[PDB]
Amino acid sequence: KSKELHAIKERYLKFVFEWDASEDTSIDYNPLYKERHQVQLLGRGFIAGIDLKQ
Amino acid sequence: KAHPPELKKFMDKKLSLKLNGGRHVQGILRGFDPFMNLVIDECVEMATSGQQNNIGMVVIRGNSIIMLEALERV
Amino acid sequence: FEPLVRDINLQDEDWNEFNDINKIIIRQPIRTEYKIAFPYLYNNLPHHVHLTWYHTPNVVFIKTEDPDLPAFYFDPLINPISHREPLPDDDEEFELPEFVEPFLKDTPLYTDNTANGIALLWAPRPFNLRSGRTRRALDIPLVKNWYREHCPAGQPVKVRVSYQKLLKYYVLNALKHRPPKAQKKRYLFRSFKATKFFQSTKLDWVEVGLQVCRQGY
Amino acid sequence: MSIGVPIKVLHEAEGHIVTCETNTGEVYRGKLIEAEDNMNCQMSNITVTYRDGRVAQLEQVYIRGSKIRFLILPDMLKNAPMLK
Amino acid sequence: MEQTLPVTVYEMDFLADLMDNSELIRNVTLCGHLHHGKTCFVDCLIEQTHPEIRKRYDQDLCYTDILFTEQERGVGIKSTPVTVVLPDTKGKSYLFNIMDTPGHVNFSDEVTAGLRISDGVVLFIDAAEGVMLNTERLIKHAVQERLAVTVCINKIDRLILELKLPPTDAYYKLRHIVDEVNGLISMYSTDENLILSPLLGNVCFSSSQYSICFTLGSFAKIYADTFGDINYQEFAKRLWGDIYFNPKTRKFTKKAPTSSSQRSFVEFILEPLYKILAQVVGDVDTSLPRTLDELGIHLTKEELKLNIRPLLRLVCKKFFGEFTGFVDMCVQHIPSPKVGAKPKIEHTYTGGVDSDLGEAMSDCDPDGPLMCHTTKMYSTDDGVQFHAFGRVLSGTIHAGQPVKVLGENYTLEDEEDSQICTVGRLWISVARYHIEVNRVPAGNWVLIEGVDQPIVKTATITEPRGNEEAQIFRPLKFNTTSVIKIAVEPVNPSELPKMLDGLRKVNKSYPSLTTKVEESGEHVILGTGELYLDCVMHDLRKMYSEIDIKVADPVVTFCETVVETSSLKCFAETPNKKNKITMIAEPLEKGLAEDIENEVVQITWNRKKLGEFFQTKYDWDLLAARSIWAFGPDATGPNILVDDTLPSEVDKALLGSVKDSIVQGFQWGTREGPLCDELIRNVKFKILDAVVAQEPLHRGGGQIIPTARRVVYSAFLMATPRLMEPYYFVEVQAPADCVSAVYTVLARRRGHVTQDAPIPGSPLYTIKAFIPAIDSFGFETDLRTHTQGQAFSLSVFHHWQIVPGDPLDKSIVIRPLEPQPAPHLAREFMIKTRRRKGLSEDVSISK
Amino acid sequence: SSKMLQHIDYRMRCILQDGRIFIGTFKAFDKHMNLILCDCDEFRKREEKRVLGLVLLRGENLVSMTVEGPPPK
Ligand SMILES: Nc1nc2c(ncn2[C@@H]2O[C@H](COP(=O)(O)OP(=O)(O)OP(=O)(O)O)[C@@H](O)[C@H]2O)c(=O)[nH]1
């Protein structure tokens, strides 16, 4: 709500080996763009890499 | 392979059928065969003499059939 | 990325009778995704806007689970079909000749490698192929399709920043890509072997590694 | 290998104007409605000329295929893909 | 002729000679839901009629999505005409004029433009998806425009390769699709002669990706060509429905022999196709050459080395061959221009079939008066000059022939809209290359050059010095209403004329585009949706005007209405203070406005039929039922004007002198509206007392019309005014798991879900919901992002509903940049729209 | 039957059962020997030529045929 209104107002008015966390994106206010519904792939497809049993 | 000739549009239809020896025949169609041998109801002879002679149930060899015309509108 | 070209800013456009914020009805904010999806509607001065690929029909592929089922089988994941015609009469004299049967009648409907052969249609490249040209070992990125996925929610911030940074260089490579220049085939090692100063053999890789280490030293 | 080209050309002639000359020397010019593998022609709007030269009008005609001497087809059929 | 063209299976001389015989021409439009396979078909046919133009192995050559944005978006945006000569099953050749129409619900105007100049419709339906939203909408539109309807169930391979249904269940799915189409047709049409069934040859089965296209007759002909002694026409009559084959008696019965017996369609058609596909995709190395030997297909060695998809395409192409089933369908069940001319003149000609010119047009005689109707305008890539496109309903158009072009406002008494022009060139339009010709007879489609100057949307091209009593064809009646509204303004005000010229050009391109200039000097574009306006602005900025254009926020068009009867009977007098009118305003009965707009009632009816209709349908007495004066701002506006003046109180003969002016005043007043200069909807205006000055020098003209408009406004303002939102109808297809996510996305935008239901034979679900148009911008993107792309939605305008708040309430305080609560949405929608229009800040409620 | 594919496109005169002569361009033939002759003219005996065009004659009345002119351009 407050971040909602603030976004509306804004729109209309050394060797660093590790990346700085300030460069992160996806720090969003809309709950639809944070809690994205996860694809289930009919319960038979799985994401690569992660352990299958998990 | 002898496909039946298409006369279903000429079904139940008053027709004039001319012949080999200059003969000509009139009536209504009731059926055919792949040899187009033709059955006629209410057949009328009307030979070249000019007098119409009626017979009725007749069946004609297709080998002598020259030309089929539907007098009534199809 | 960084700004492609210095231009006007969101704080640089003065109030006009056009863009007056008192004439604007706000229901839901115009997110950046809305401006990417329709670059010519939600955006002023669109340049270098590559139109995104619109919807692709949903591939309703039923992944098999048990190989002891028929290849063509009404899977429970498929919603049932609720049951409920100028046909000729039986007495109509139409008979099918003696030597006429459906085209492939002896051929079985499905073989023991039909379910697997269909699942290969939707396999990612190169598993949807059956022939091709060999690639170099270093030209095969095994994780390139890992970081092209969505940023994984719940991972620490370092992981997500790594994902985005990998995507940045991927996009830069795909964008700054230049055509390979035309040239005339000249090979260094063939030239070396042509001269009398070099000779060929066949050694273990470790031995050659030791030789290269000592030679560099 | 089964059905000859001229029968195919006659099939193409359906819908055009055709003139038909049967063994009795009778000329039938009219719109060809249908044709079969045999020369059985169902053809319409006939301007029919007899041997003596008398001309008549007859709206529907069906000619037995065995009893055609020759059939004159419209010239645009010379460009049929089947004639190449 | 004399134009370098791709080599064809036929020769263009044959094509030119076919155009003269109107009985061998088929004017067909391809329509269907989005991405239902309508475009390969065209190349899936261009390839079969163009040996050198082939589809790429890994990429489909759309060949009719010739546009830039069409090629990147992969979405049909504009109709593309294709003229090809296609052979029949019997070897006969017909000339086909095919209209490839876009399937997106936003671009329905292109579909109506195609439907106007077409005699038949081929509806494409995905075999897996089934009957979707646009399929129903296009069925309704086609049966309403009196077009022959045929169905092509495309993408049947999805039943085999994706869903992997058993052949019997694939048959059930196909029968269910056909039954759904039949039910829709019977719903939107009264006469029964449009029964769709593969037994009648109406329905074809196809898979354009793999070059499969067969009817029952074509497959029976494949059998006959293999085994000579069978009659394929009688065979085809037993290949559908609950008719089973008995191999012992070699006869087809209506009862299954014993048990485990399959229907004829499964045994003879579906099972062989299943086996072909299964062999190709599973046993290509093991047991493919043997089956190919059985079917008589011999593939060369380098041909068997192909990938599975090109190999399947090639095998099916060899087995099936040309698309003769499609041509059989369209020849048997789509009228030729000669036969279909009469319904076309009956429906789309203002003069009616009975007119003398109507008769000559209904004959479709190419030696008669010229009568060409153009509905599409195609711009050359330079974007300077356009080319009109339409069919020649009568006569014959020639290159270099001067013509008289009639606009949309041209009447037989106002002959000022007509303009003489000179035809420059004529092209027989094909998808990509234009084949220039010298003349085009009746019944054909022609691309005309030189008549683009005086036309905006549609035209009727006739001959000068003849055809004096030549009227026009009715302007296109579209499926939807343009609601989404955006404003445009050049970045540099110096180049305003350039943007105006570009606006004229885009108005020419898009049939349903409405560009208007508001009172405040604001240029406004009306569109159907986000994609529609996106592509409109893409064309405007890049194609027609090379300047930079600013775009305002999207907004919708509102409508104004009432909810009770006016408290005090309003009155208004002329400046002469002699003529006085008294009116009251009350809301119309439920469901009457829709009856009025949909031409269920017309004021052209005699007073008797009007009265009886109102009496039997809405409980009106004869006095009021026959008392109707006008029917809203247009001839079919959703408002009614009724006179309750008693014969004793006011002399009716004198009232007739001012009837013709009160009607105009009421029409203009409803056209403007007092709240925010929006249309008035669903309002009944009753006149109670009309004091008329006897002297005609005092009444009539510019004295009584403004009084009528003012009294209309004041009467409207007494009964509680309300605003009206356009409501969108959204259909969403999504898997079972993402249904809840769809609900969550909808709940945030004032959405109200009507129904979710499984798609029979598919693992997906259809969610149908209602969403306000204004609370819909980015809804598609929200739904496709929250669901990771697994849910897709198409939205179309449905109806008008009242905004929750009360527009006339000064107690509400609104901040400039915050979303408002529903209790006072109407107040914001009203004042902000007024500010946008440039009017005062608030209304002045008075008498 | 190469004995007549060799004769295609050649200007051919064919003799009919009733004595009619048909001169034209040989286009096509079938097993029943129905002939396709384009820009065909008929010669009857008193000399007279009647231009007819594309003639499809049934095999019944065809008797004898002979090359008269080389294929045109
Ligand atoms: N599985 C399958 N996919 C097909 C078939 N035919 C086409 N497609 C694909 O489905 C999509 C449909 O694209 P088009 O055929 O161009 O779409 P359209 O029907 O013209 O509709 P619009 O996008 O509105 O123009 C593309 O990805 C095609 O390659 C088919 O028979 N089977």
Residue numbers in the entry:
A (entry chain D): 243 to 255, 271 to 311
B (entry chain n): 3 to 76
C (entry chain A): 279 to 362, 369 to 501
D (entry chain k): 1 to 84
E (entry chain C): 105 to 951
F (entry chain h): 6 to 50, 61 to 88
Paper quotes:
The 20S U5 small nuclear ribonucleoprotein particle (snRNP) is a 17-subunit RNA–protein complex and a precursor of the U4/U6.U5 tri-snRNP, the major building block of the precatalytic spliceosome. The 39-subunit U4/U6.U5 tri-snRNP is the largest preassembled building block of the spliceosome, which joins the splicing pathway at the precatalytic (pre-B) stage and delivers two components of the RNA catalytic core, the U5 and U6 snRNAs, in their inactive configurations requiring further remodeling. CD2BP2 is a hallmark protein of the 20S U5 snRNP, absent from the mature tri-snRNP. Here we report a high-resolution cryogenic electron microscopy structure of the 20S U5 snRNP, shedding light on the mutually exclusive interfaces utilized during tri-snRNP assembly and the role of the CD2BP2 in facilitating this process.
We determined a cryogenic electron microscopy (cryo-EM) structure of the CD2BP2-bound 20S U5 snRNP complex at the 3.1 Å resolution. In all reconstructions, PRP8 provides the scaffold for the entire complex and interacts with multiple other subunits. PRP6 is present in the sample, but only its N-terminal helices are visible, and the tetratricopeptide (TPR) repeat remains disordered. We observed two well-defined densities located near PRP8RT/En and PRP8Nterm domains, which were assigned to CD2BP2 domains D1 (62-130) and D2 (150-233), respectively. The CD2BP2GYF domain (280-341) and its binding partner DIM1 are not visible in our structure. A hook-shaped extension of the CD2BP2D1 bridges the PRP8RT/En and PRP8Nterm domains and probably stabilizes their relative orientation, which differs from the one observed in the tri-snRNP. Therefore, CD2BP2 constitutes a two-layered buffer blocking the DIM1–PRP8 interaction by simultaneously binding to the interfaces on both PRP8 and DIM1. Second, CD2BP2 acts as a placeholder preventing PRP8RT/En association with its numerous binding partners in a wrong spatiotemporal context. Our data shows that DIM1 competes with CD2BP2 for the same binding site on PRP8.
